[PDB]
Subunit: 409 residues, 3 copies
């Protein structure tokens, strides 16, 4: 594949250029800023595109989710993809606080989630964010600090996406305007990813120059041991339990029937690319009828956020812990809800692991140029994330036969 | 009706909760801020929607006003609905300064009306507002303070609405895009009004807690005696004179012929809901032909701002007087022109008295959470405002028979 | 013509009012600000419209440039209209620094061209601009100062215009939405130009009042001797050489064959108005086939920026030199690239010399009210600019017969 091979060949040459400058020359504090300029322009190019990508892919992802939730079968998969998303948020927050990869009020930060879901302006929500601060027996002021409001542009586009879906023929030009705006801002991300090999070369090399000790290669080992532990309690302990609670039919036999599509997800790392394969393995091996697989698998490519909350919401807390933030427990729930929501906006993006992380790091107020620690090993962890998304969707096929049995007639 | 009954039942339970907390417990200065948080989220939800509601309803209200002003009949109703709008602005400013409900340069503030009609940026006009200040033999600086520019987003959408109406078939996708955007942002205001009973419960109760003296129940009695005096010189003295100046046929006989539609407006408080009724009473009782009633009544549901300048531009000055502002005479004309213009944007909104007031209080730089004094008694005054809008439109039927008599052949 | 006669009659009455106030009365520092208020509102009206004019005319100018570059003929005119545009930028920068009309780091300002082509936000690019500053062995901070980012709204709309052109039928509603938005924001500029005679009357008169010495009538004579010298090395020395390098057929005979359309351009000063004439003189007199004139003349009305870089990028440096700026050499290339790019956005505007200058003066951070020095003599220099655009396009017809000879079969 091109986009995988070229990114690995730019991480290898990024470390090759990176140690042949710090151990072979000596740059100033200014010339280590001009050396990381082609990787600076990539971070401006990526933040440029997340505003028409959030707005267009949330409006069309939700206005096409209607008529894919027809009946009660499409409602008994929205409850399932919210019940295992909420457990994956709790499992991602617990595992990043217990392990703490990258080390050494709370009510006023949970009421800013609900304040930022409903902004006071839709144009200010594209570049500003409401943060409140207790001061003086106390009183409370609000500031509107900078940084994009991703939570309020997603709650509004989820409401605006439901309204124009149900409007019928009067709101067909609004679905057609944003379907074409979503196709046009996924062909610009394909143009940016033709520059992304050159940009991550000078982004990796600008980090190995400034790094003086190999402690950051240990915090990058405890990060892969928090993602591969979040994505191994979910595939072994959490999701085979949820199947066995309602469907008493041995969940380790269900996964062996899907072993052709689990092994295919380790080679592509894209859920919508092996979506023709997981259709072919579910019906023939597990003996499930086609009227419920065609109703939960198209909603399971928009709503299945089990893998994001264990990978991109552990990465975005690891970056925040890397900058010596204490974060409390109220700004961790702020991050893991912004990281889980931003993956619905970065829905079918080509390099959807890199783009989603630039959305959350720009939203929660972190340096987006710290994503180059994550894309060094993103090609290992995105393969295993979509093995959970394929296994999570396959258990979402065999669960809605059991709550929907009298509905099929 | 649901939206009336539920709002009265949330004002009654708002005062019931409000006196069973201040006279039964004791909250801190912080716990009186967390008690009014469900009413804070309503004020964020309302300010969220006034930006796509101003833009879409002004573009479609004006691009559909073309072909409803065909001939000279539709021009002799635009002059009439500007001549009685300007008298209602003068009558609303005089009555709120002479009575002063809620008590105890000028050239640089009239040149900021004309500066804010033509902003220097269309994206900055969505959240910022130009205020100029004389300083030092003097010189003049400009600041761009915050708060939405409603005047400049209405003057531009009035020009942009006329241009795409007259473009014909080349500008039909622009009328279709904003017709669907206006239908989609009136179905979101219907979703907000399903939360508005809960929000105004904690908004009323958060005001009765902090109020320690019943002087504010006297300033709320002088406010209803300024609206019901502005809307009783207009229906008795001003508008029956304007009929009798040009049409010498006893205006108190004209209103008795419309008594079925005046009494219907006291039960619905919506001009476009009794618009089928005022068609049926004008032609049969007053003997007016249908070629001029169908030409002045659709422009009389977009342009008839006689009732707004006596109700929502007396309320927005009463709120400004409540915060101990002196206002001069130049910032009163700023308010009553912003309040009269913002009711064309809040054109056919369900709760169009509450939404219009949040537009003007956010525009002229006032606390939008002070609208809860007004919605306590809005269900009394909005019935009597639309009785003036029905009587003002009925006299706008019997006036254009007299200036248009040779035009009908 | 109306728009020429009325503008000359407002420059004459502007100087007539201007010397009958300063030599016949005495105004304060405040009353010389209220006297130039009708010309202030014109500068707010002009800056109001450059945001939907840049966005709509760049998207439709580029999405219609596709299928006008079919084959290799339409590629051998994009190289020619970039090779003579880059020489006109170098000739405009050299001539405004050598003559310096209006008198008496660099790497951090060339890396801000590339930083401002790719902004971090599309809504902030409509009103804000990234300027970086070296400070402290040094480090580099970035600020986001105010003023519209014209470079980043043109690079994005050039990429977004190419993507929706090549999308075919899926991106036809996006071409139809911006074709109608571009027709609707050229009919608002025609409404503004009905006020522009009144606005430039009080704009000229507000400058002759404050001027106390006639040195500014000498710097306005060295400005016309830099534009008419830039547009006389291009028409005599630069462009007849580029023809004679590749096409050995005596370029002074080519221009005599186009003498009917050169003389017509001195009477209209519009390239797309004499575009039917330069078609009729190229084929009959110079004996060129119609298959290459119809392929380079529609791309030569969007891409031919030879005349802008010698007129509007010498004017925008002359205004910057007038305010006693030193500008280095890095902020001169910033101006002449912003002035050359902004003339693709002001593509077919009626008063396209006045509107283009308000775009660049607002972009590079200059007073837009200093354009009234330029529109005093714009009707002399815009005639001679389009004589170079007609001569530059005619030599762009006789050049693509020589590189395309085996392609025509
Ligand atoms: C299923 N994905 C996580 C890949 C996209 C939904 O946000
Ligand atoms: C006639 N109304 C006042 C109800 C709407 C026009 O703004
Ligand atoms: C050819 N013009 C310069 C007139 C427009 C292209 O920007």
């Amino acid at each position: 594949n091109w986009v995988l091979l070229s990114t690995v060949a730019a991480v290898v040459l990024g470390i090759t250029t990176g140690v042949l400058v710090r151990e072979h020359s000596n740059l100033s504090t200014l010339e280590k800023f001009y050396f990381a300029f082609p990787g600076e322009i990539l971070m401006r190019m990526l933040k440029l595109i997340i505003l028409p990508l959030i707005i267009s892919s949330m409006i069309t992802g939700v206005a096409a989710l209607d008529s894919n939730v027809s009946g009660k079968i499409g409602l008994r998969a929205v409850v399932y993809y919210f019940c295992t998303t909420l457990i994956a948020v709790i499992l991602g927050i617990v595992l990043v606080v217990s392990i703490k990869p990258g080390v050494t009020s709370t009510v006023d930060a949970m009421l800013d989630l609900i304040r930022n879901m409903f902004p006071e302006n839709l144009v200010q929500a594209c570049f500003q964010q409401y943060k409140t601060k207790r001061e003086e027996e106390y009183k409370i002021v609000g500031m509107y600090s900078d940084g994009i409001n991703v939570l309020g542009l997603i709650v509004f586009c989820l409401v605006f996406g439901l309204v124009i879906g149900k409007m019928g023929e009067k709101g067909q030009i609004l679905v057609d305007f944003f379907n074409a705006l979503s196709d046009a801002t996924m062909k610009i991300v394909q143009i940016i990813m033709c520059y992304m090999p050159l940009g991550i070369l000078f982004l990796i090399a600008g980090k190995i120059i400034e790094v003086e000790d190999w402690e950051i290669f240990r915090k990058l080992g405890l990060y892969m041991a928090t993602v591969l532990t979040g994505l191994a309690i979910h595939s072994i302990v959490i999701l085979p339990l949820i199947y066995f609670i309602v469907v008493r039919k041995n969940p380790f036999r269900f996964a062996m029937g899907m072993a052709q599509a689990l092994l295919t997800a380790l080679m592509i790392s894209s859920s919508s690319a092996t979506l023709p394969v997981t259709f072919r393995c579910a019906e023939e091996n597990n003996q499930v009828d086609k009227r419920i697989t065609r109703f939960v698998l198209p909603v399971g490519a928009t709503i299945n956020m089990d893998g994001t909350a264990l990978y991109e919401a552990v990465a975005a807390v690891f970056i925040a812990q890397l900058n010596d933030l204490d974060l409390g427990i109220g700004q961790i729930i702020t991050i893991s809800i912004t990281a889980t929501s931003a993956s619905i906006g970065a829905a079918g993006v080509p390099q959807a692991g890199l783009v989603t992380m630039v959305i959350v790091l720009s939203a929660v107020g972190l340096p987006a140029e710290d994503v180059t620690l994550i894309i060094a090993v993103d090609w290992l962890l995105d393969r295993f994330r979509t093995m959970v998304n394929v296994l999570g969707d396959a258990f979402g096929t065999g669960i809605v036969e059991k709550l929907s049995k009298k509905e099929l007639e």
